[PDB]
Design a protein around this ligand. Structure first.
Ligand SMILES: [Ca+2]
Ligand SMILES: [Ca+2]
Lengths: 316, 316
C-alpha cells in the first residue's frame, strides 16, 4: 500500500519533475495534496501548472484529484526574478494545454484558490489516517509555520520530511555580492524556517543537500533519451523540463520516497546560520558532540534514479 | 508550383519557426538548402537542429533532403552569450530526438559538415534552374559575401531577399553600455554586410524591420492554442519554441514568402550606420531624394499570420 504524501514545492522545473515522479506511481504513493510557495516561481503560475499536471494524471491514469494551496509565506531573501519565470513558460507548453485538462482545471481552480497553503499543509497532515510523508522541494517556511502553530499535534502525524536543501561538506549555490557562496538557495530563502525544522527533535528529516544532489548530473546525453518515449505525455513533460552544470536536485526527494534504497543516509548535527552576514543560510556541521539533526543523503544511485525517471515517464 | 527558397538563419527559436513554416508547405515552397551562422546560436547546435527538422519532415511528409552549411562568417559585434543557448536546448527536446530522425541525421551529418555556408549559398543560387528567394533570419554576412565575390553572376539569380532586420521609424533592440538603443541585432552583428546588401541596386529586398515585427505579438493566449493540436509534431515544436514582450520576428519572413499579401510594402531609402559609435548598426531613412533601397514591411496581418502558423503546424 501506498505512502501518504504531500508535496510542498515552489514551482520550478525540478519541482514538477518531483511531482510527476510522485503522481505517476500510485502503487507506491497516494498524493493527498500539494502546496506551492512564491519562492522560485510566481505562485499563480506554479499553482496553475500543479493543477494541470493533477488534471492530466486524473484523466490518463485515474489518480484522484486533491487540494492545492498557495502559501502566503514571504521571502526573507528572494530568488532572482529571472529564474522565477519557469512556471510561466511551462504553463504555455502544449503538453500543459490539452483541452480536457484546461477545462477541468478551470472548474477546480476557484475552490483551490481559496485555500491557504500553510493551513492546508497543517490540516492535511493532522486529519490524515496514516502518518504523512512531506516532500519539501522549496523553502521550509510552511513546515516551520505548522510546527510553530501546532507543535506536537502536527509533528506526531509526520512520518518523515524529505527535503531538498543545504550544503554540508561542499560549497553552496547562492552567489550574490552580499554572500560568500556557502549557502544553498532553499535554506537562504528563509533561514529561520530551516533552523526550526532541521533541528526539531520530533521530526524525522532526510536532507538532500548539494552534497548528494551534485553527484547526479542531468546531462544532454540523458535528456535526449526522452525522444524514444515521445508518445508518452509525461516524457514530453520531463524531457522538456530538463531540456529547458545541471543536477537532479528536487527530483531526488521524490525518488527517495519511491525507493529509499536509492541513497546512503548519514546522521549529521547541523547548525543553520540565520545571521545577516555573508554566510547567511549556511548549513555547516555543528561543533561539539551534539545530537544529530538529520540524515544527510550520500552518493545516491545514478542508475536507480535514471531507471525510475524513465519508467515513471512511460506511465502515460 | 513552388518557389525555390534558401533559408539563411542563425539558429534561434524564431529561426526554426521560420524553417518550419517553409518546410511544412511544399506546395508553395521548395526548400533547396539552409545556411546556419554562428550569430544568435552556437553554430554546431543550430546545424544539428536544422538537420533534425529536415529529417523529421522527410520522414513524415516526404519533403526532400537538402544540403545544410555552416557559415564561417565571424561577428563584428557578437550576440550576448546567454541568448545563444536556445539551439542547444532545442537539440535536447524530445520532439527533436525521435529515434528515426536521430539515426538519419547521424548518416547525413558528415557530408553536410564539409560544406562552407557562404559558398553553399552562392552555389545553390547560381546553379538553380529558377531564380531563388533567399529568406534571411540571421545577419546579412552570407549574402554580402556572395555579392562581393560573384556580383551579378549571383544577384541575377535572386528572385527576392526577404530579411529580418533593422528599425526604421521605431527604436532598436540593441541595449548595451556602448549603444544608444537605435539599432537592431541582426544589422548590428555585421553592419557593413547589411549596408552591402540593403543598398545593392540589383537585388529586390523586402525588409521585416522592428516597425512591422513589433506589431505581431506572440502572447501566452496564442501559444496556449498549440495544446489542442499536441498530436502534431510540428505543434509540439512551435508551441515549445514560443513557450520557451515577444514578437513573431523571424517567422514573419517565411510567412511573407508563403503569402506576400500578409503585409503592406513601403519603399524606403535607408542609410546603414557602419560607424563604431553609439548608433552603430542603425538603419535610418536616408536624407535627400535618393533611390529607395528596399520595400519595408508595414502592418502585417496578425490574423493571416496566426492562421498560417496554426495550419502549418497541423501538417504533421
Ligand atoms: Ca524547488
Ligand atoms: Ca534569427
Amino acid at each position: 500500500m501506498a505512502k501518504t504524501v504531500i508535496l510542498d514545492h515552489d514551482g520550478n522545473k525540478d519541482d514538477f519533475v518531483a511531482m510527476i515522479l510522485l503522481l505517476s506511481n500510485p502503487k507506491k504513493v497516494n498524493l493527498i495534496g500539494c502546496i506551492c510557495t512564491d519562492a522560485d516561481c510566481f505562485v499563480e503560475n506554479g499553482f496553475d501548472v500543479t493543477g494541470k499536471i493533477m488534471c492530466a494524471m486524473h484523466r490518463l491514469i485515474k489518480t484522484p484529484l486533491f487540494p492545492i494551496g498557495k502559501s502566503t509565506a514571504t521571502a526573507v531573501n528572494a530568488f532572482p526574478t529571472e529564474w522565477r519565470f519557469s512556471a510561466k513558460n511551462l504553463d504555455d507548453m502544449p503538453f500543459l494545454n490539452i483541452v480536457e485538462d484546461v477545462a477541468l482545471w478551470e472548474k477546480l481552480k476557484p475552490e483551490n484558490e481559496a485555500h491557504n497553503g500553510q493551513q492546508l499543509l497543517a490540516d492535511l497532515v493532522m486529519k490524515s489516517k496514516e502518518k504523512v510523508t512531506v516532500c519539501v522541494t522549496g523553502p521550509l517556511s510552511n513546515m516551520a509555520w505548522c510546527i510553530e502553530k501546532y507543535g506536537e499535534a502536527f509533528t506526531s502525524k509526520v512520518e518523515e520530511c524529505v527535503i531538498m536543501g543545504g550544503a554540508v561538506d561542499v560549497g553552496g549555490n547562492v552567489f550574490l555580492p552580499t554572500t560568500d557562496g556557502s549557502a544553498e538557495w532553499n535554506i537562504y530563502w528563509d533561514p529561520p524556517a530551516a533552523k526550526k525544522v532541521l533541528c526539531c527533535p520530533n521530526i524525522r528529516c532526510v536532507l538532500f543537500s548539494l552534497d548528494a544532489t551534485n553527484t547526479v548530473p542531468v546531462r544532454s546525453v540523458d535528456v535526449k533519451g526522452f525522444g524514444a518515449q515521445n508518445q508518452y505525455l509525461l516524457s514530453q513533460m520531463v524531457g522538456t523540463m530538463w531540456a529547458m552544470a545541471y543536477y537532479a536536485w528536487d527530483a531526488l526527494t521524490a525518488a527517495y520516497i519511491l525507493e529509499p534504497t536509492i541513497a546512503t543516509l548519514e546522521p549529521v548535527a547541523l547548525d543553520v546560520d540565520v545571521s545577516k552576514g555573508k554566510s547567511e543560510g549556511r548549513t555547516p556541521r555543528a561543533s561539539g558532540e551534539g545530537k544529530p539533526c538529520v540524515h544527510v543523503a550520500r552518493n545516491p544511485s545514478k542508475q536507480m534514479f535514471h531507471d525510475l525517471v524513465f519508467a515513471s515517464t512511460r506511465v502515460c
